[PDB]
Design a protein around this ligand. Structure first.
Ligand SMILES: [Mg+2]
Ligand SMILES: [Zn+2]
Ligand SMILES: [Zn+2]
Ligand SMILES: [Zn+2]
Lengths: 67, 110, 765, 228, 146, 151, 183, 43, 150
């Protein structure tokens, strides 16, 4: 849905890195691995937190009932 | 027999005529083939069905394995013909069956 | 980098799925129904007359669903999600044009609504058809919903694909200590019957029909069908082979044992045994009754004085019996995939609407008789008030049949249940796998595992892993990823083609030479013989690859039973293969480059003869390569991509070829029960039960299938950091050790949503 | 040898799938020792030893000529040449239609005569020609097939897939002291209730001894006792 | 396996062109079935034997099978060396098609590949035909469970 | 065949041809032509088609001037555009090596033998005139012919 | 390496083909004796062919049984409905040219036992009706269109066909590619 | 034929004898998922 | 709606037929840890592997570990997927053992575990069978009047 605040295994804050990861991928495009490493996501648990996240909240917001 | 009429090609039958003559009379058509001292014979071969040897046993053509049967205190068997069947549920694994080659004792190690 | 044919021919699979989706059996069946089968039903039941008042008739001119002639736009349908919320039926109105005569010689048309048609989601008549996710957001629909189901009274019902044995085909079965019986369940457009065909004793062959009192000797029926030489009977059913002569000759003796026979004598014999016809047209009880007995003995209705077609059908029926007599293993496997047909939601609804419309017409004519039985002042103006009233029964029965799954068909007279099931909303994969699911025919004597085993003939047609557990193990089946279900093609355009290609009609052939050359069978019926069956089959396959005949028509040759078989009926499962010619594949990656660049969609691979559909039967005549590197100079086809032997649900498994098969089947079971994301409108939905994962993740190890079915868009699971080790002793026997503070951070965190529905009902007071 | 076999044993059904009669012999040899007994217990032999059958007509008489071959009856070790084949034909064709005077012209060309509302003679002679190569001339009429087995030794026991135990025991060349069938109801009718309970106990112990089912024999003994 | 496959092929060509010695107890057609099934069983047993003999000390499946807590050397050999022969109804994979198990083999092929023998192990992965045959065997096990 | 269960040779009793089930196929090919005695699946079919071509040439030459021989032809029912179809339609060219071809129009096709009809055949003109209806016998068919379009 | 023209003809000639399944073409090396045809009968509007061949009297007749069983059995009647099949052309070669005459309603003649029928009916003596019912109803109601078997005249037919193929000649224009769709 | 007679009440798996006489539902009973516990005594 | 915390007895599975309930929920500091301090979310018994022969699950663990370390989602497609040797190359090039076995420390003793532990990401599905909907207990209450039974 929305990016989890913390890595499930580590407890490291990853909820402040989703947008920077997206802008690293889009603006001045980087590979996913180097984008993850540039954000400090060194451990593979924190890496998968961002790598495997499905941003479903954007799809959910298309059906906003309070327009 | 299995003979057919030349006229209507219906099956011919033997009919008892006068003086007990065994003619090849044709039902459904005026056809008569009589027997004047002629031997109408039908010969069909039959299988010989020869002798068969002792059944014995073809256990050399079975999959052995390296297992010691529970009856190792009676016979020193380290082999067992086996087949594996999953008589357990899909969540469970497979079950293996065994038969010691030294005594003929069967057991399933699951 | 240049295209490599080996690792880039798999793009044919996304190309095929783009225009032929996973939920396409239901969609194509419903579209065909509402576009042509409605027309066929209206034209068959086109004129209801009255015994009184001959200068008066009612004519059904046209039938249309959800569209009138007043405007180019269609009628406004209540959107399917609004139907789901409001507990109503997503249905469109049925319109007909009526030619009802006026008392003053007035001819007029109309646009009359005779009920509501429950519309399949994402069909031609649906509002979600070709919606661009913005219209979908406006209509509160997930763009990733499969469609292919119905919303009846707010409930999503799916008409499951049905397995059955093929009709109008001979099936020979043996037995131990009973004898040999072989049947032909023959279904006409209005009467279904099984011309059962059994052996009783002494190797005597009998015909056992439901209408006939006692099983009739086969020679009697063969003579009754015009084949009356009694040497050509044995020539037709035994040919020149001495063994079959001896096996069959016993029931030649019983032909004359009663009395010798003309055609008409055996006719009268067979007609004596007709049971009854509800005591109407009693004055037909003569030798004339055998004519209807023979003409309604099978699907080969005879409408003239020539009985050679039915006679040869019974003759081949007998000949198959006699081969089974000489040896078993000449019987055919009843669980063979080629011997089964898949009936679809459109066919079900077509027959159900036929019955409902017949009832509607009968009751409308009853009302017409009641109105016009009055002597005077019989005004004609507005004779359609009653039809305005009586349109409710079509809608009511059509909704009730889908809602309950019970289908009471008076005309055909069976009561089948479980046709429809509530669509599974446990997960996205649960819904998708509920679609493309097939239910097999009941009354199967489940005590045995006969129709429970995996057959090799289902390779690439039915998923080899997606089978249920507990009780329906092997009975409920699932479609493989890349499959097609054939439609009905008219066989008279292609019988003419067979005659053009060298087939001699059975009316030009003598009995003595019939088993000398190959016979040619069209949908199970011996239509003629041919010299050079190999050349005939090659010419037919070339003519199909060039598009002169339908690509779903199958031709294959049988060596044991000297027969070239051509099948045009619908319900046959088939899949596309790359055609291998002269030891080379026909795609050669120029077509792959064009396909990837944008030209040459999948259909153009069929139009250029690079790919073709093969049903289970043509695979007997084929020799498929799994890969390019094993194309040997004797192979006819090449696998497009071999992982398509698994279905949609089994495609969730990573590296399934490295697992024991029961584990793959069990994951097919578990993935449908996994908690995850349901839809893009899942928070707009109000369902009876809905489990939702708070933080779903797409799998790190995915497959081509999960991205083909968009499972990575609505994933059900999470990538847990896992240490495989013995720990704490609380993990013995499948038990898992979960991390506190991973649960605290939201791992495995889900929620359940439950709806409760109450109606404030008005009362008669 | 599993759940179905246990079902048959504890149902005490009169007919079982694959009944076996283990019949130890007296001598140790293949040629003219075990084959003689095997031939003594066989299903049917006229098709085996006929080599053809005729359907013959003449001016006033008919023949069904069977030329029994001596070579088959010699190599296949059986004790029957002419007369017992003829009497078996008489009895079986009397059970089928009739037999009043079956002749033997000699030299193994046995002839069966047919004589007496018309063509019924022809029909009866056709039926006789069909039913003739199915009669039993040698062997007990209760054995589907006999087989010689080896018990991992130089002992060539024969065990038969038949429904006659008393006949096998009273057959010459077999020891009736040690000749057991696996049909409990047959043991009961032939040897008695005590042998029946022994057979029940042994059959059950064999059935679960072939599956690794370690059940104490006292439970099996109690089952046999409650059944008998 | 090449040694065993070559013997099966030689027996196949003998059974095709002429007449091999029919076994005394069983009729002609199933003599080849029994012979080549036994040969494949022997090759699977020896491959599993060398697999187990070369298995490392402290191998987890080996320890679990030795202590008897879970599994067997047969399971270890199927995972590592070879998944031997897919047997249903007590014999090899029967014909799902006309005189043929799959259309990916030639007609009238009795070769071990065409009738259920899985040369691969679960570590190397199953080719599509071996996958189908193993699925058939697992499914019949599952139906026996039911 | 095998063992046959033994004033006019045409008025004696007729039995079917009985071949053993073991050699049924070998005899079937031999008796496909032997029953008449008129005065691998690709190569075998092509060689049999060459045999049919040579037999077609032989019978066509043997019918060149005879006043009763007939050859029934099976032509495609929708012939190429040129029934009320009048005049010459084309040619039956004899290609080299003995093989045949037929040009029913501008189209080139091929010609086969057809099923071997082991029974007496006859063509007859039916002329039901109101004054007097007569059935006129014309001749007897010596063998059928199938003309097949090729692509 | 040569050419043999084929000419269509007989656009009006009704040329039925008789298939006597009862008798083979060639019993021995020579063709079997062509039978003698008398009392031919054919029915318009239903296409039934009834052909009578007299039975030999010097051998194999069973005259006494014949009279004591069925009154008039001097001949054998072969009945067979001519079946409309298209694409069939009976042909002959006259001058190294094959002349094609279209076939009308090939007939498969099988023996018929009208005498048995009459004996059985004389023993037994002491509504749209659509489908194949109408076929037999018409066949046994409207009948008796007598035919006279005039055997021997070929030469006139032969010259008429030759006159019909020599006086007419036409060429074809249709493309081969269009023909494969015209198939 | 859905008419439930007196002998239909008594006959069947969910009938009278096999469903309520020797075998029935009991008070003071529970059912839930089972989990492992090594620190629990075997009894 | 009702939020649900994974509790004791809730069912999970891992795409390979290896299902099971939560036997215990343990504090993070009681979990084994690697050199970077990575702590497993789930611990699964090695005894579930030898008899079930889900080698695909081990290959999935290694491929997912290589994929997370490489930034790329890996493929486990039937008859194909990402080769095991390439994943081992990724693991080695990033400092991990080629076979995905890491040296862990005990969370409760702190010492090195004497065996290397198979350590990596596996996709785990939470199944709809939660113990909260299965826990039932009746002392007395409703009875069917016909039979006067519960
Ligand atoms: Mg379990
Ligand atoms: Zn972390
Ligand atoms: Zn006759
Ligand atoms: Zn032992």
């Amino acid at each position: 849905m929305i990016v989890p605040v913390r890595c499930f295994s580590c407890g490291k804050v990853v909820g402040d890195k989703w947008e920077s990861y997206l802008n690293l991928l889009q603006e001045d495009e980087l590979d996913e691995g180097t984008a993850l490493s540039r954000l400090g996501l060194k451990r593979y648990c924190c890496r998968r937190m961002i790598l495997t996240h499905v941003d479903l909240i954007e799809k959910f917001l298309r059906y906003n009932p309070l327009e | 027999m299995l003979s057919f009429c030349p006229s209507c090609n219906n099956m011919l039958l033997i009919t008892s005529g006068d003086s007990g003559v065994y003619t090849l009379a044709c039902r459904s058509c005026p056809y008569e083939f009589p027997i004047e001292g002629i031997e109408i014979y039908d010969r069909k071969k039959l299988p010989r069905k020869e002798v068969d040897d002792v059944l014995g046993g073809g256990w050399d053509n079975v999959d052995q394995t390296k297992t010691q049967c529970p009856n190792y205190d009676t016979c020193g068997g380290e082999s067992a013909y086996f087949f594996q069947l999953q008589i357990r549920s899909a969540d469970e694994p497979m079950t293996t069956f065994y038969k010691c080659v030294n005594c003929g004792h069967r057991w399933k190690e699951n | 980098d240049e295209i490599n044919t080996a690792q880039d021919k798999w793009h044919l699979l996304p190309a095929f799925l783009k225009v032929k989706g996973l939920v396409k059996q239901h969609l194509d069946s419903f579209n065909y129904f509402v576009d042509t089968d409605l027309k066929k039903i209206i034209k068959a039941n086109q004129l209801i007359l009255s015994d009184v008042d001959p200068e008066f008739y009612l004519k059904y001119v046209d039938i249309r669903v959800g569209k009138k002639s007043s405007s180019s736009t269609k009628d406004y349908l209540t959107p399917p999600h609004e139907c789901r919320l409001r507990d109503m039926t997503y249905s469109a109105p049925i319109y007909v044009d009526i030619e009802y005569t006026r008392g003053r010689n007035i001819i007029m048309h109309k646009d009359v609504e005779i009920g509501r048609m429950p519309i399949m989601l994402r069909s031609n008549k649906c509002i979600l058809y070709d919606a661009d996710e913005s219209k979908m957001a406006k209509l509160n629909e997930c763009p990733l919903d499969p469609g292919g189901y119905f919303i009846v009274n707010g409930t999503e019902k799916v008409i499951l694909v049905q397995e059955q044995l093929s009709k109008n085909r001979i099936i020979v079965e043996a037995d131990e200590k009973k004898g040999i019986v072989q049947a032909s369940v023959t279904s006409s457009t209005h009467e279904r019957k099984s011309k059962t065909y059994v052996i009783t004793k002494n190797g005597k062959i009998y015909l056992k029909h439901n209408s006939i009192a006692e099983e009739i000797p086969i020679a009697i029926v063969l003579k009754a069908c015009g084949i009356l030489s009694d040497l050509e009977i044995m020539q037709l059913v035994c040919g020149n082979d001495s063994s079959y002569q001896d096996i069959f000759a016993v029931n030649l003796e019983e032909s004359s044992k009663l009395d010798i026979y003309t055609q008409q004598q055996a006719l009268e014999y067979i007609g004596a045994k007709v049971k009854t016809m509800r005591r109407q047209k009693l004055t037909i009880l003569q030798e004339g009754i055998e004519a209807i007995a023979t003409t309604v003995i099978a699907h080969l209705t005879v409408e003239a004085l020539d009985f050679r077609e039915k006679a040869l059908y019974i003759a081949m029926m007998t000949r198959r019996v006699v081969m089974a007599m000489y040896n078993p293993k000449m019987i055919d496997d009843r669980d063979y995939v080629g011997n089964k047909r898949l009936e679809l939601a459109g066919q079900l609804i077509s027959l159900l609407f036929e019955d409902l419309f017949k009832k509607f017409n009968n009751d409308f004519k009853l009302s017409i008789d009641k109105v016009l039985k009055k002597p005077n002042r019989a005004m004609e103006y507005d004779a359609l008030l009653s039809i305005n009233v009586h349109s409710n029964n079509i809608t009511s029965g059509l909704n009730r049949a889908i809602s309950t799954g019970n289908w009471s068909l008076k005309r055909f007279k069976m009561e089948r249940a479980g046709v429809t099931h509530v669509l599974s909303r446990l997960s996205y994969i649960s819904a998708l796998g509920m679609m493309t699911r097939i239910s097999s025919q009941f009354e199967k004597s489940r005590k045995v595992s006969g129709p429970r085993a995996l057959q090799p003939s289902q390779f690439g047609m039915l998923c080899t892993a997606d089978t249920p557990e507990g009780e329906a193990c092997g009975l409920v089946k699932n479609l493989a990823l890349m499959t097609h279900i054939t439609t009905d093609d008219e066989e008279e355009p292609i019988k003419k083609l067979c005659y053009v290609l060298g087939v001699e009609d059975i009316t030009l052939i003598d009995s003595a030479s019939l088993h000398l050359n190959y016979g040619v069978y069209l949908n199970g019926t011996l239509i003629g013989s041919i010299r050079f069956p190999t050349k005939f089959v090659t010419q037919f396959r070339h003519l199909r690859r060039t598009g002169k005949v339908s690509e779903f028509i199958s031709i294959y040759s049988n060596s044991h039973q000297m027969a070239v078989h051509i099948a045009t009926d619908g319900g046959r499962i088939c899949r596309p293969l790359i055609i291998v010619s002269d030891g080379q594949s026909r795609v050669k990656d120029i077509h792959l480059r064009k396909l990837l660049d944008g030209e040459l969609d999948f259909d153009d691979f069929l139009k250029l003869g690079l790919v073709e559909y093969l049903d289970v039967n043509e695979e007997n005549d084929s020799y498929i390569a799994l890969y390019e590197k094993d194309i040997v100079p004797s192979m006819t086809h090449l696998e497009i991509e071999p992982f398509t032997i698994l279905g949609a649900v089994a495609g969730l498994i990573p590296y399934p070829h490295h697992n024991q098969s029961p584990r793959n089947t069990y994951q097919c079971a578990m993935g449908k029960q996994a908690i995850g994301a349901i839809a893009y409108n899942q928070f707009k939905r109000i369902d009876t039960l809905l489990y939702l994962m708070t933080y779903p993740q797409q799998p790190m190890v995915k497959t081509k299938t999960i991205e083909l079915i968009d499972y990575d868009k609505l994933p059900a699971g999470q990538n847990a950091t896992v240490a495989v080790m013995s720990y704490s002793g609380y993990d013995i026997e499948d038990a898992l050790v979960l991390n506190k503070s991973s649960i605290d951070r939201g791992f495995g965190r889900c929620e359940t949503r439950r709806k409760t529905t109450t109606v404030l009902k008005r009362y008669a007071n | 040898l599993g759940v179905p076999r246990i079902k048959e044993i504890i149902n005490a059904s009169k007919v079982i799938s694959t009944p076996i009669i283990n019949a130890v012999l007296v001598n140790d040899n293949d040629e003219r020792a075990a084959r003689v007994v095997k031939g003594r217990v066989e299903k049917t032999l006229l098709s085996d030893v006929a080599f053809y059958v005729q359907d013959v007509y003449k001016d006033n008489l008919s023949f069904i000529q069977v030329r029994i071959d001596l070579g088959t009856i010699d190599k296949l070790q059986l004790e029957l040449t002419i007369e017992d084949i003829a009497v078996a034909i008489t009895r079986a064709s009397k059970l089928k239609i009739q037999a009043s005077d079956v002749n033997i012209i000699g030299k193994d060309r046995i002839a069966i005569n047919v004589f007496p509302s018309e063509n019924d003679v022809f029909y009866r002679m056709q039926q006789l020609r069909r039913a003739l190569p199915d009669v039993v001339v040698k062997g007990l009429p209760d054995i589907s097939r006999a087989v010689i087995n080896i018990r991992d030794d130089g002992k060539r026991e024969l065990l038969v897939e038949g429904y006659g135990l008393r006949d096998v025991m009273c057959t010459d060349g077999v020891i009736g002291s040690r000749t057991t069938t696996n049909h409990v109801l047959e043991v009961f009718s032939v040897l008695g209730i005590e042998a029946a309970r022994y057979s029940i106990i042994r059959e059950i112990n064999y059935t679960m001894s072939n599956h690794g089912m370690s059940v104490d024999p006292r439970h099996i003994q109690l089952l046999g006792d409650v059944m008998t | 396996v090449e040694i065993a496959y070559h013997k099966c092929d030689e027996l196949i060509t003998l059974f095709n062109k002429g007449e091999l010695e029919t076994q005394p107890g069983c009729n002609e057609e199933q003599t080849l079935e029994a012979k080549i099934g036994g040969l494949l069983s022997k090759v699977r047993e020896e491959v599993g034997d060398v697999c187990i003999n070369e298995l490392d000390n402290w191998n987890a499946p080996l320890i679990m099978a030795t202590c008897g807590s879970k599994g067997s050397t047969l399971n270890v050999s199927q995972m590592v060396a070879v998944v031997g022969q897919q047997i249903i109804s007590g014999n090899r994979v029967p014909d799902g098609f006309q005189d043929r198990s799959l259309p990916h083999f030639p007609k009238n092929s009795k070769t071990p590949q065409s009738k259920g023998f899985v040369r691969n192990s679960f570590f190397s992965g199953l080719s599509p035909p071996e996958f189908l045959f193993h699925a058939i065997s697992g499914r019949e096990g599952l139906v026996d469970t039911a | 065949x095998x063992x046959x269960x033994x004033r006019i040779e045409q008025l004696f009793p007729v039995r079917p041809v009985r071949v053993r089930h073991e050699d049924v196929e070998t005899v079937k090919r031999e008796i496909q032509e032997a029953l008449s005695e008129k005065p691998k699946e690709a190569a075998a079919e092509l060689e049999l088609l060459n045999a049919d071509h040579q037999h077609i040439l032989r019978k066509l030459k043997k019918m060149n001037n005879k006043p009763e021989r007939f050859m029934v032809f099976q032509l495609p029912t929708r012939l190429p555009a040129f029934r009320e179809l009048a005049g010459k339609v084309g040619s039956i060219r004899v290609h080299k090596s003995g093989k045949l071809s037929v040009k029913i129009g501008n189209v080139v096709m091929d010609i086969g033998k057809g099923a071997e009809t082991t029974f007496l055949q006859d063509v007859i003109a039916l002329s039901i005139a109101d004054d007097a209806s007569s059935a006129e016998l014309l001749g007897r068919v010596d063998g059928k012919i199938v003309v097949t379009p090729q692509i | 390496i040569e050419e043999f023209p084929l000419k269509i003809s007989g656009e009006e000639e009704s040329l039925h083909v008789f298939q006597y399944a009862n008798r083979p073409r060639l019993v021995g090396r020579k063709p079997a004796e062509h039978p003698f045809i008398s009392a031919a009968r054919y029915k318009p509007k239903s296409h039934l062919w009834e052909i009578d061949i007299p039975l030999d009297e010097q051998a194999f007749y069973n005259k006494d049984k014949a009279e004591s069983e069925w009154n008039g059995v001097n001949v054998q009647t072969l009945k067979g409905v001519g079946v409309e099949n298209n694409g069939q052309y009976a042909a002959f070669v006259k001058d190294m040219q094959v002349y094609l005459v279209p076939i009308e309603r090939v007939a498969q003649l099988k023996p018929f036992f009208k005498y048995i029928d009459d004996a059985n009916v004389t023993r037994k003596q002491e509504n749209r009706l659509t489908g194949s019912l109408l076929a037999h109803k018409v066949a046994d109601e409207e009948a008796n269109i007598e035919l006279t078997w005039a055997e021997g005249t070929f030469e006139q037919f032969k010259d008429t066909i030759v006159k019909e193929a020599e006086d007419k000649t036409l060429v074809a224009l249709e493309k081969q590619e269009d023909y494969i769709d015209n198939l | 034929k859905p008419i439930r007679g007196f002998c239909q009440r008594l006959k069947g798996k969910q009938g009278r004898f096999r469903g309520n006489l020797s075998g029935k539902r009991v008070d003071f009973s529970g059912r839930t998922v089972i989990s492992p516990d090594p620190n629990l005594s075997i009894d | 709606r009702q939020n649900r915390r994974p509790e004791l007895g809730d069912k999970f599975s891992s795409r390979h037929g290896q299902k099971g309930v939560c036997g215990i929920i343990v504090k993070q500091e009681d979990m084994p840890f690697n050199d970077q301090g990575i702590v497993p979310d789930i611990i699964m018994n090695p005894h579930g592997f030898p008899s079930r022969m889900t080698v695909g699950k081990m290959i999935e663990l290694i491929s997912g570990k290589a994929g997370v370390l490489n930034g790329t989602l890996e493929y486990g497609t039937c008859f194909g997927g990402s080769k095991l040797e390439d994943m081992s190359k990724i693991l080695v090039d990033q400092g991990f053992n080629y076979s995905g076995k890491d040296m862990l420390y005990s969370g409760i003793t702190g010492e090195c575990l004497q065996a290397y532990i198979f350590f990596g990401p596996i996709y785990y599905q939470k199944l709809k069978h939660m113990v909260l909907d299965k826990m039932h207990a009746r002392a007395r209450g409703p009875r069917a009047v016909l039979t006067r039974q519960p």
